[PDB]
Amino acid sequence: MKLVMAIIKPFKLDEVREALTSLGIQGLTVSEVKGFGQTEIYRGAEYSVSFLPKVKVEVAVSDDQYEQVVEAIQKAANTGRIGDGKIFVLDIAQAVRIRTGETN
């Protein structure tokens, strides 16, 4: 199993969600994060006064499906412009379904 994580432009969330569902991928979770590009001095130190909003999507997928999921996310999240973001795949050592306690 692999954890697929992607940092995408907020307005691309629905396209990515649609792409994943079409593949029959379930279990996506999303949250807001911030990136940086615009600074102001306060008490001798520099403070960022502007941020770029992003959405972080995370979904666990089988070894046999992850490459297809990664390709699908990339195609859906792409604009070609600055700030499009990244997709990272991490190996999962163990996964548990909380509802039943089943492992792997």
| Residue positions forming the annotated binding site for 2-oxoglutarate | 37, 54
Judge contact between 8 and 83, C-beta under 8 A: no
Other beta carbons within 10 angstroms of residue 50's beta carbon come to 10
Q: Which of 51, 38, 52, 49 is nearest to 85 (CA)?
A: 52
String of contacts with its own copies for each residue 50-69, x by CB under 8 A = ----x-x-x-x---------
Q: How far apart are CA 5 and CA 91, in angstroms?
A: 11
44 touching its own copies, by CB under 8 A = no
Q: Which residues are annotated as a binding site for AMP?
A: 60, 85-86
Of 10, 24, 25, 33, the one binding its own copies (CB under 8 A) is 33
Q: Which of 39, 49, 51 is nearest to 10 (CA)?
A: 51
34 touching its own copies, by CB under 8 A = yes
Binding site for its own copies (CB under 8 A): 1-3, 6-8, 14-15, 17-18, 27-36, 45-48, 54, 56, 58, 60, 70, 74, 77-82, 84-101
